[PDB]
Amino acid sequence: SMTSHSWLCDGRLLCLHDPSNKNNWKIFRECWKQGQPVLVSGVHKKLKSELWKPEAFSQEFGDQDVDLVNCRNCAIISDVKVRDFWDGFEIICKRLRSEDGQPMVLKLKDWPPGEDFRDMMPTRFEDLMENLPLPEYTKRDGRLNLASRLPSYFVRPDLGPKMYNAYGLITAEDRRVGTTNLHLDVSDAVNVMVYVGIPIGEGAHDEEVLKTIDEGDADEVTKERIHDHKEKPGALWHIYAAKDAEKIRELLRKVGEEQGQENPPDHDPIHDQSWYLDQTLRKRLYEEYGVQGWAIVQFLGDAVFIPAGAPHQVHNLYSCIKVAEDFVSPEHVKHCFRLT
């Protein structure tokens, strides 16, 4: 039967099933007030799927100049054409190669750049903004979005949305690297998976993806989405409560020191955006500091709600197109205040 919601992370994470149901706020606000993330499935079924294809992005925008990042070593690839990224999104034999001659796992940096999404892609902008879940929270003029209503004593989000485009991580060694490193934001955010690209050429990569999900501490209900429903998994997230941020900074200072980094005793390893918590570091955070996170697999059409002040990291299982919008809920506005 079709139901309003279910629970992931062994009862710790709300999953809403109908992205446009006007009754969702009744389910959402109790979990949100506690500082928990929330997942909403099914947003892909509301979108014009022809607007979100990698081939359309290459055809329409391919002559723009951009920078990429090699996810395996953090090296910047400067001043290339955006088609050089998009044409290798799913076809491995078209990817830019590293010195060792392997195809690179690449992230497209800051594209569209700054606040330019609305001006460069007005039809995409309309399609996404009109179909965001929890619209009183997430729409620029929503009654529970304080983004446009606050004085300069608060840090306001930029005008969005923002696009996040990167290849999938492939090997056993890649399991220890992030697409986006551990960091926190002072605004709330909703992040929608609009396209998952399962590649070809090295097409038969199905078992390292299951081992990544399993080692990432993903729940059994999450594994039933793949095996029973054949949903396409895009990315593995770890999210931590805002109240656990200082204990995470203590762990990463101790590890920085063990590894011969020479940081002052006050430095901020979360703001630095330089760490990915692999299986070893997550176990150590739990055993040594008592801190547990939410391990979330974001499938095609899933919208992840990230509370302000919550440390989070992202590991792409396949090639992903994500679009995220920032907002300021009254529940979490304290995290963007500039005093005390």
Ligand SMILES: Oc1ccc(CN2CCc3ccccc3C2)cc1
């Ligand atoms: O795509 C769909 C997914 C689930 C449903 C099922 N209904 C059940 C009633 C209800 C009440 C409150 C909030 C949500 C719901 C969802 C319908 C469509």
Ligand SMILES: [Cl-]
């Ligand atoms: Cl909070």
Ligand SMILES: [Cl-]
């Ligand atoms: Cl457009």
Ligand SMILES: [Cl-]
């Ligand atoms: Cl709402």
Ligand SMILES: [Cl-]
């Ligand atoms: Cl990063």
Ligand SMILES: [Mn+2]
């Ligand atoms: Mn972020």
